[PDB]
């Protein structure tokens, strides 16, 4: 007889439809404090409208808090990236926005040498077997 071992499928983003990793960006600032002069000028400029038009699958907030500026980015996987933008000018805040946008939310990691491909599929040619070898050893 045959019994079934229940399992679940693995999400493979990109093979079918590609869902963009970032989902929400928050542009927090303060109306009092020199640390947010750059973010203020960014929000008053015409750049934020351009960013909305060009990337309209991302949800943009702007919020006022009595503290340092910030840039929160929620991603599909669930994590959140927060950037402190103290004492930065307009272009630097924009560049930090670029980094958050074009990044998956994965936790930063350390990679070994040549560790560049991660596949969840099996091997087209099976694992080497000494018994089923090209030519027998000695």
């Amino acid at each position: 007889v045959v019994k079934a071992i229940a399992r679940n499928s693995i999400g493979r983003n990109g093979v079918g439809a590609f869902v963009f990793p970032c989902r929400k960006i928050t542009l927090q600032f303060c109306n009092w404090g020199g640390s947010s002069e750059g973010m203020r000028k960014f929000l008053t400029s015409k750049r934020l409208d351009k960013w909305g038009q060009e990337f309209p699958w991302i949800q943009f907030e702007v919020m006022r808090k009595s503290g340092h500026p910030l840039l929160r980015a929620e991603y599909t996987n669930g994590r959140e990236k927060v950037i402190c933008v103290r004492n930065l000018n307009i272009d630097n805040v924009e560049n930090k926005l670029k980094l958050l946008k074009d990044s998956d939310g994965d936790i930063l990691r350390r990679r070994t040498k040549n560790d560049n491909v991660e596949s969840l599929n099996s091997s087209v040619r099976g694992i080497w077997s000494p018994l089923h070898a090209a030519k027998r050893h000695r």
């Binding site: 007889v1 045959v2 019994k3 079934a4 071992i5 229940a6 399992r7 679940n8 499928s9 693995i10 999400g11 493979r12 093979v15 079918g16 439809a17 869902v19 963009f20 989902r23 929400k24 309209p56 699958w57 991302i58 949800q59 943009f60 599909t76 996987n77 669930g78 969840l120 599929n121 099996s122 018994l131």
Partner: protein
């Protein structure tokens, strides 16, 4: 003015908007618009239908609202109109999802056993996978109390763009989890949102593009990875293989030894082939003769059950699961 009156107006306005879901206010919700074309939904899918997908049959508040001392409070949901709801959409979504995945799995793996196919179909459209898909897509559950939104003065468009259903505030607080039905579970609510989306993408595009929702399903659901080899668990493969050989024209199978090494050792190696005549049906290894014979029998059965014909072949209908 008495602030209680102001909350009256806000509460009535929120109830009215949900009861109607006008497109004018639904189109002002950034969550809806972003959720709309993040998944590349057709331009013919009005944002109101997207909200209707997110809405849930929260018609009448239960008898557990009466006291939260028993571990249950529902303050985040407003009563919804019976006509505008996802109750009818999720049935369509469930019907579409079940048909396509079952059809597509069979087409790829004709000879699957019924039990294994049900497991494979479950894996693709399980309640958990659909719930995870919803969270991946960014669907949000309305958790803030209606009063809380009043003080913060939240426009209705935001609440209109979130998953709305009876939410058991105080669910996991202090570890006391009151057990309720599937109607009060976030997992079920999210899954039917995904099914609801599948339904709407069909109704709108069924007339002009018949194979549209199915293309969407193959884009998001069947693009996921699944190894059928891991869904099998045999009991008596040798007897079952013999029955298969008798049923078809194949000859009686005999398992023979090919190579061995370290016979008198802790971990020997034996290779045995199930010969259905001169042809070999299965290959198997192991640390014991009995283990190798079992592995070889399982391999032959697995190969039969998991055969994948080419897309250009004439459709092949399995003669049914082997019955011993």
């Amino acid at each position: 003015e008495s602030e209680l009156a102001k909350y009256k107006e806000y509460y009535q306005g929120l109830k009215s908007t949900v009861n109607e879901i006008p497109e004018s206010v639904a189109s002002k919700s950034p969550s809806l618009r972003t959720l709309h074309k993040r998944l590349q939904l057709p331009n013919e899918l009005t944002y109101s239908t997207l909200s209707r997908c997110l809405t849930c049959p929260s018609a009448k508040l239960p008898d557990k609202i009466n006291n939260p001392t028993k571990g249950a409070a529902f303050v985040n949901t407003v009563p919804t109109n019976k006509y505008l709801d996802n109750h009818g959409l999720n049935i369509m979504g469930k019907n579409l999802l079940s048909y396509h995945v079952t059809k597509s799995i069979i087409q790829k793996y004709p000879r699957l056993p019924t039990v294994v196919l049900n497991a494979a179909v479950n894996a693709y459209i399980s309640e958990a996978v659909l719930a995870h898909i919803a969270k991946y897509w960014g669907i949000e559950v309305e958790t803030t109390s209606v009063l809380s939104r009043y003080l913060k003065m939240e426009p209705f468009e935001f609440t209109l763009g979130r998953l709305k259903f009876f939410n058991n505030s105080l669910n996991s607080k202090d570890g006391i989890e009151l057990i309720t039905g599937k109607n009060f579970s976030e997992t079920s609510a999210l899954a039917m949102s995904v099914r609801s989306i599948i339904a709407a993408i069909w109704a709108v595009t069924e007339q002009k593009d018949s194979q549209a929702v199915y293309r969407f399903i193959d884009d998001h659901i069947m693009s996921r990875k699944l190894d059928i080899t891991k869904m099998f668990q045999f009991e008596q493969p040798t007897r079952e293989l013999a029955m298969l050989c008798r049923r078809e024209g194949l000859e009686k199978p005999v398992s023979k030894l090919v190579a061995e090494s370290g016979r008198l050792s802790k971990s020997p190696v034996f290779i045995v082939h199930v010969f259905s005549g001169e042809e070999t049906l299965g290959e198997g290894y192991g640390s014991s003769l009995k283990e190798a014979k079992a592995r070889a029998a399982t391999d032959a059965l697995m190969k039969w059950y998991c055969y994948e014909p080419l897309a250009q072949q004439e459709p092949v209908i399995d003669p049914g699961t082997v019955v011993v």
